[PDB]
Amino acid sequence: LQHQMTIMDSKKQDHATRKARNKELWDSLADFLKGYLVPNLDDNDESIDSLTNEVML
Amino acid sequence: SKARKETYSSYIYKVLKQTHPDTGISQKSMSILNSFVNDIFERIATEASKLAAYNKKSTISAREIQTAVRLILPGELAKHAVSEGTRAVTKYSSS
Amino acid sequence: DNIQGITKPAIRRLARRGGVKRISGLIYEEVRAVLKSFLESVIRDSVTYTEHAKRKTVTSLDVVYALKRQGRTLYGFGG
Amino acid sequence: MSLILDDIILSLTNANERTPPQALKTTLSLLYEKSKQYGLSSPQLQALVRLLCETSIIDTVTKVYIVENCFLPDGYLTKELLLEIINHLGTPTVFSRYRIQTPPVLQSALCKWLVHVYFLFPVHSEREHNISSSIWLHLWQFSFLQKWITPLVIWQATTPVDVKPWKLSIIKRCAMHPGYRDAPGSATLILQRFQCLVGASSQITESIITINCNRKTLKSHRNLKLDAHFLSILKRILSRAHPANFPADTVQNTIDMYLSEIHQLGADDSTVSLWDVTSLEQLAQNWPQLHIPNDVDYMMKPRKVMSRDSLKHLYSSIILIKNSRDESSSPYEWCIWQLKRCFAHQIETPQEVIPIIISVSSMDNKLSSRIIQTFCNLKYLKLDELTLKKVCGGILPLWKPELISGTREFFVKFMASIFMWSTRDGNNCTFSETCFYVLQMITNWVLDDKLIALGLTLLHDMQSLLTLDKIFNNATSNRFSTMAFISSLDILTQLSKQTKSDYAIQYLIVGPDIMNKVFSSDDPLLLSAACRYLVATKNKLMQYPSTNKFVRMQNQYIMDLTNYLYRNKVLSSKSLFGVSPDFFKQILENLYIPTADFKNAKFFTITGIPALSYICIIILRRLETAENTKIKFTSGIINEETFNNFFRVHHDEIGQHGWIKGVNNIHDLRVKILMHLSNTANPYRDIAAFLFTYLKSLSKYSVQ
Numbered sequence: 001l002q003h004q005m006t007i008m009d010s011k012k013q014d015h016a017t018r019k020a021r022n023k024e025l026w027d028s029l030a031d032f033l034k035g036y037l038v039p040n041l042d043d044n045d046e047s048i049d050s051l052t053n054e055v056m057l
Numbered sequence: 058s059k060a061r062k063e064t065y066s067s068y069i070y071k072v073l074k075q076t077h078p079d080t081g082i083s084q085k086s087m088s089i090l091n092s093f094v095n096d097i098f099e100r101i102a103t104e105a106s107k108l109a110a111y112n113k114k115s116t117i118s119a120r121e122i123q124t125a126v127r128l129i130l131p132g133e134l135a136k137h138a139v140s141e142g143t144r145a146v147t148k149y150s151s152s
Numbered sequence: 153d154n155i156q157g158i159t160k161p162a163i164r165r166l167a168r169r170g171g172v173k174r175i176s177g178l179i180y181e182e183v184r185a186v187l188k189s190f191l192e193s194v195i196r197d198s199v200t201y202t203e204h205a206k207r208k209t210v211t212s213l214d215v216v217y218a219l220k221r222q223g224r225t226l227y228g229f230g231g
Numbered sequence: 232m233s234l235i236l237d238d239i240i241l242s243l244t245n246a247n248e249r250t251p252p253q254a255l256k257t258t259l260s261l262l263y264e265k266s267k268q269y270g271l272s273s274p275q276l277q278a279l280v281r282l283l284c285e286t287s288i289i290d291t292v293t294k295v296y297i298v299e300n301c302f303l304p305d306g307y308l309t310k311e312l313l314l315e316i317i318n319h320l321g322t323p324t325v326f327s328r329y330r331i332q333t334p335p336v337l338q339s340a341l342c343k344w345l346v347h348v349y350f351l352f353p354v355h356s357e358r359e360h361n362i363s364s365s366i367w368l369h370l371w372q373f374s375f376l377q378k379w380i381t382p383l384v385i386w387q388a389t390t391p392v393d394v395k396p397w398k399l400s401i402i403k404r405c406a407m408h409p410g411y412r413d414a415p416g417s418a419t420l421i422l423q424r425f426q427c428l429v430g431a432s433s434q435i436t437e438s439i440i441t442i443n444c445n446r447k448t449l450k451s452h453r454n455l456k457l458d459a460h461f462l463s464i465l466k467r468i469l470s471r472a473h474p475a476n477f478p479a480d481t482v483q484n485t486i487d488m489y490l491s492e493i494h495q496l497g498a499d500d501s502t503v504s505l506w507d508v509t510s511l512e513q514l515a516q517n518w519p520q521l522h523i524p525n526d527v528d529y530m531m532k533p534r535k536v537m538s539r540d541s542l543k544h545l546y547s548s549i550i551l552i553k554n555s556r557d558e559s560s561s562p563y564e565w566c567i568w569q570l571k572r573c574f575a576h577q578i579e580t581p582q583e584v585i586p587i588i589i590s591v592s593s594m595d596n597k598l599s600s601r602i603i604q605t606f607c608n609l610k611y612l613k614l615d616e617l618t619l620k621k622v623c624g625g626i627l628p629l630w631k632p633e634l635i636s637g638t639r640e641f642f643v644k645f646m647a648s649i650f651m652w653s654t655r656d657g658n659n660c661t662f663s664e665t666c667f668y669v670l671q672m673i674t675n676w677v678l679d680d681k682l683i684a685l686g687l688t689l690l691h692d693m694q695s696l697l698t699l700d701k702i703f704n705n706a707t708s709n710r711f712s713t714m715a716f717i718s719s720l721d722i723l724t725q726l727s728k729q730t731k732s733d734y735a736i737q738y739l740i741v742g743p744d745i746m747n748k749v750f751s752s753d754d755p756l757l758l759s760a761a762c763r764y765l766v767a768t769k770n771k772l773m774q775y776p777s778t779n780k781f782v783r784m785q786n787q788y789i790m791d792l793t794n795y796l797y798r799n800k801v802l803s804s805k806s807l808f809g810v811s812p813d814f815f816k817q818i819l820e821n822l823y824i825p826t827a828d829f830k831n832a833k834f835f836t837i838t839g840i841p842a843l844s845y846i847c848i849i850i851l852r853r854l855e856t857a858e859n860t861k862i863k864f865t866s867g868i869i870n871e872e873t874f875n876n877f878f879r880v881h882h883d884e885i886g887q888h889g890w891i892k893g894v895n896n897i898h899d900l901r902v903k904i905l906m907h908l909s910n911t912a913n914p915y916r917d918i919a920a921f922l923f924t925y926l927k928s929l930s931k932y933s934v935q
Contacts, residue, residue: 181494
């Protein structure tokens with residue numbers, strides 16, 4: 001047990017539901033585009049959300 | 058200061074000189090011959106002891122040694138070995 | 153570390169002494185493994201003899217005694 | 232120690248644009264020696280690896296050198312450091328053109344570093360490994376570092392799940408891609424590694440034969456060349472930082488088997504049932520996934536060995552670890568149900584059930600409290616006396632109740648039930664035997680600091696019941712009663728020796744008129760305990776005043792005992808054991824003696840007491856054999872009338888040899904036998920030891 005608790009915890013690290021994660025996964029991809037990828041796209045000659053909405057779809 | 062090494066070196070050298078005097082011996086060959094003689098003697102002695110112990114024979118004699126050497130040495134050399142050994146023992150008894 | 157230290161020209165010379173004319177790649181570390189196995193087999197009994205003798209050095213008498221116990225008798229080293 | 236190493240990394244970070252001629256080199260020179268000496272722990276590496284890419288003032292030639300030499304980690308180097316390296320890894324593009332590009336050669340050198348220390352990587356939580364494995368595969372597509380992550384990718388992916396067709400397509404396409412020059416060599420080992428994971432995989436052998444090479448380079452690509460100097464220092468660094476952790480022999484071995492895996496490529500709550508559990512090492516990995524099939528027949532009916540039956544008794548214990556123990560637990564109910572059957576004899580036979588349940592009930596004192604409290608009844612004794620006796624020897628002395636601290640009142644009623652059971656029965660001696668186990672339990676209460684007074688109060692009620700006419704007697708009684716009582720006196724004697732227990736002294740002090748029973752009873756072993764208790768008691772009670780109930784009864788005991796033993800002046804005294812001496816006189820004239828010279832002096836002495844009468848003769852006969860005198864002592868009892876008559880008859884022969892040397896008369900004789908009795912080791916050495924201190928005449932010869 002002492003050797004196991006040194007490895008602890010594999011399960012708690014993941015825990016710290018799948019449907020809830022799916023919404024977060026969509027939101028994580030949504031926020032990544034608007035913050036980093038869309039500004040690097042520098043298209044539409046100016047765009048923050050209109051270009052972002054196109055790449056979400 | 059050193060306890061003497063118990064070898065057959067002088068007798069092996071004497072045998073070689075009796076055969077022919079021109080050549081000599083190297084140290085590695087000398088060690089090889091000494092080891093071979095010791096191994097053969099150990100084999101024959103162990104065989105004689107085991108054979109004597111089998112027939113609850115308390116002693117070791119010429120018959121036991123001859124049987125042991127016949128067991129160990131193959132027959133081709135064994136014939137000459139037993140002939141020469143019998144000659145030696147009979148002549149020693151005569152002396 | 154030194155298992156690879158045994159260099160492949162030495163194995164080449166061993167193969168040439170054996171009598172082959174063609175060499176593959178697997179035989180190199182196969183020879184290394186078989187040498188390691190033979191060495192460990194001899195060394196275990198050599199160390200056993202040395203430790204029983206209460207001496208803390210290994211001698212030619214001990215190694216030839218271990219070899220003879222294995223059955224591969226070695227000549228020319230005394231004893 | 233490591234704080235200065237932090238400053239050295241911070242020194243290269245605090246100052247920028249300075250461009251010194253040699254100050255920058257000296258700081259790097261100081262980093263060369265400090266990195267190997269102190270290990271460059273994981274937080275230091277994360278700041279360092281970020282500093283190399285952030286600042287381009289240092290040339291990429293020395294950036295590779297410090298990665299090759301300074302990067303000798305002693306820390307845990309968790310995924311946070313690897314993630315920072317992953318951030319450094321990559322290539323500039325249109326989206327990342329603003330971000331500064333790290334040198335590809337530095338990336339290859341960085342990719343070379345974690346391969347050497349992959350063995351030090353954390354045991355993953357199998358949640359971010361899928362992200363990391365995909366990240367490493369995506370990073371593997373870069374050619375300048377493809378040759379170094381390829382041995383890595385072989386390592387972290389060990390499962391059929393990690394062998395994913397989308398990963399197969401990427402690896403195969405790179406080999407099929409023309410502009411790599413190293414992917415076909417790199418992909419072949421990865422495909423071979425993926426082959427041994429999933430199995431046959433006829434799809435993976437058709438890809439290898441398409442991308443196969445002359446395989447001399449593959450043989451060189453199978454071999455991974457790790458710097459021996461890098462690993463030799465790493466072994467020393469790891470051992471020094473963490474003693475008894477990351478041993479040097481295993482660190483070299485762990486790298487070797489990781490290297491040998493690459494060489495082998497050329498040649499080649501989740502429910503787990505407790506029924507199938509066999510290995511405790513597997514159970515350690517199975518501990519989060521342990522599940523117990525609820526079967527009552529097995530989990531108590533069948534160690535250092537390895538087997539399913541090795542964890543047999545542990546099965547009944549790990550469930551108490553898996554879930555909290557309760558009165559409704561099936562193992563806790565099986566014992567009671569089996570116990571209920573055994574008393575009623577509904578079971579086949581109770582003899583084999585007892586040892587197993589006793590061992591279980593020996594521990595788990597809170598559970599044993601339930602068992603003892605319900606089966607300690609008068610009715611449960613009627614069914615069978617032996618089965619109640621058997622369970623009294625197992626769980627009584629090992630029980631320490633702390634649930635309510637009010638179980639004392641239940642015992643006095645229940646203990647008297649066995650005694651009353653023994654009265655009308657007419658003896659069985661089962662009462663005294665059952666008391667001895669309780670006395671053992673009482674000492675367990677005494678040993679505990681809590682309820683010290685509660686246990687002592689229970690002990691006192693035992694002595695009153697044990698000192699009754701029917702159970703204890705000098706005419707008709709059993710050795711069981713006396714042997715139970717002698718153990719009680721040792722408990723109080725041992726309690727006097729202990730100074731860490733500040734108890735009530737009236738509990739230690741025994742009753743005034745209860746000592747007349749033990750003193751009057753002529754049991755030689757019993758009298759030995761009284762002398763030990765009296766001597767030990769006088770060690771205490773020294774700060775008490777001259778006038779006090781406790782100290783007056785103690786001095787009364789000393790005076791009465793010596794008068795009854797050696798003083799031989801009971802008639803001149805005012806009382807003896809609460810009895811006036813003139814009562815003793817009246818019996819004496821009614822008694823008849825054929826020749827009564829000194830009638831009063833014979834009865835009351837060490838030799839005249841029946842308890843020590845014959846043992847006195849035994850010692851004398853030993854003396855006569857050793858000295859080998861002329862005349863032996865023919866009489867069977869030693870007293871004044873026999874001694875002088877023995878000397879008067881042989882008065883002619885007394886003058887030349889007399890008797891054993893060193894003795895002139897009976898008065899000298901009575902001590903000489905006691906000197907031997909005190910010299911040898913025997914139960915009645917304690918009798919002579921007590922008499923030495925309070926004989927004032929012989930105390931003079933002792934020092935102080």
